[PDB]
Amino acid sequence: SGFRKMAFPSGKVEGCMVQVTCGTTTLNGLWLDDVVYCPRHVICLNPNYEDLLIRKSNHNFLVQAGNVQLRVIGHSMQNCVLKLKVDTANPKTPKYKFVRIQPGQTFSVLACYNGSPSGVYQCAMRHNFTIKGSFLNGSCGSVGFNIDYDCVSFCYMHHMELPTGVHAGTDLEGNFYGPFVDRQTAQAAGTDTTITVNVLAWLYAAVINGDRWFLNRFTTTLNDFNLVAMKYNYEPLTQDHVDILGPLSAQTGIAVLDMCASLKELLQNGMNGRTILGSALLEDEFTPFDVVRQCS
Amino acid sequence: SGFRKMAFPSGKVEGCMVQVTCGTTTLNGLWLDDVVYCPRHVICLNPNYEDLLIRKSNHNFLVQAGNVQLRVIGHSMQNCVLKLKVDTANPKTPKYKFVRIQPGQTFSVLACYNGSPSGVYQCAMRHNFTIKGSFLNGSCGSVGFNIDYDCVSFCYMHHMELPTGVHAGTDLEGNFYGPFVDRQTAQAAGTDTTITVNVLAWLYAAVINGDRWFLNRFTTTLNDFNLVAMKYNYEPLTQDHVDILGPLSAQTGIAVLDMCASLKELLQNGMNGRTILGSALLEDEFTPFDVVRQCS
């Protein structure tokens, strides 16, 4: 029993983190086989990165894995990421993939500074392609990931903090999530919504853990729910979402549209001083998979 | 910017986790140098553990580190923990200490099953010596820890889930936190309180991150605050707590007793629909050290 924001064990990723210094700028890089991946900002209001890279030499890049220095033998740019070819393959390279994630999906972040891991936490990709992280100066190049069996699926490399204090970055091919750029500029994200399917998954987690006070005998229709959903800035619920919640509905014996009637009531009336899984708010950063993984 | 429940990177602990099987019972163990530490329950309503251990042989203990089997060459009991001497020193043994923590202090938990890490999260030791964890059957032997520099301070080994769904365990010398025993019985914890000094630390984290709506021009006395604190089941605030919050008070320019007047107002009036660091409740599982570590 119990339900926590739970990150993946970070050890496989810790063994890949290095420090990359170019001139006066230091940030983090990801060392997989004989390539180090890092934000291209390490070579700097609006840079001409192609010009800046042509003017670099391999010896300008100082790459340190712990104490050991790795020598750069080649460099190339891929969108907003640099690929530094090094003379040594990382012996701790796990099985891995570069996967781009969808809004509403979660991942673990290993916050890293000067190439040294600092902490681990869970994030969700918001529908406006930001994440609500915890990052200080020098965190550029920290990565987000999921683990399946022994395989690390890297999905995020950190680049930017927005004026609102949320964070923006790229996938590991260097393509930004959302309408952001890697420049020293103030950038605004689009409007965000609440991830409805995750709220429902978390209500199922609560029932599995013994929180039932919000249940009711009523069932609603998908469309009557969405009418109420649009009013409170919730993502419209779809049949595929209903299908994805099937396993949790089966385990608890509570049909999805039955749970939707509970959510509608919570949106209209609040919690009236009560809490769900220790929260006084409706939590939307647990996916259905996250609940099944942790509750089973 | 941003403030998250942040665990320590778990890699140093992952390399120490093994599986211990005795008869039909399997749980997790902690492999440091040539000793495996695990809950003594692995040898089982009220066992006579001294009798049960005398009847065991080294060859009854199946210890597996990944695929590799470790052979037990000796065994002894230390309070509620077994020490299994093995023929191989763990080559990944980090610098480490066994430290017992105080109520109100936090640590990271690496939830482990069949010797394999599953996830990482932060916990606080409550004043009733329970933790609000996330643990399923087979999680016995999972450990909690803090990291300072390169040194792992192990503080918790998991044994028990209470009927209320909170968790109980021992330090790594096998001595339980709180009035609990390692038996298949329903056990109740004492009454709990809210960790006042941590709530204040978290209010400082909020100010550092730009949440100021709860501030006010008023200052209170320590005793007038505690009169209100006792009414809402908060731990009495002491001068040492005030001293510990000094660095955060200095960074924000908000005196501790000034912040106490804000907390008193929040206790009496609530938040009136607003949130602090994404929460609609007063959060008490961040220590002053946790805030400084993450905000700096």
Numbering used by the authors:
A (entry chain A), B (entry chain A): 1 to 44, 50 to 301
Mind quoting what the paper says about this structure?
The main protease (Mpro, also known as nsp5 or 3CLpro) is necessary to digest nsps at over 11 distinct sites during viral replication. The homodimeric cysteine protease Mpro specifically cleaves polypeptides with glutamine in the P1 position. Mpro of SARS-CoV-2 plays a vital role in the replication and pathogenesis of virus. Additionally, its high conservation within the Coronaviridae family makes it an attractive therapeutic target for developing broad-spectrum agents.
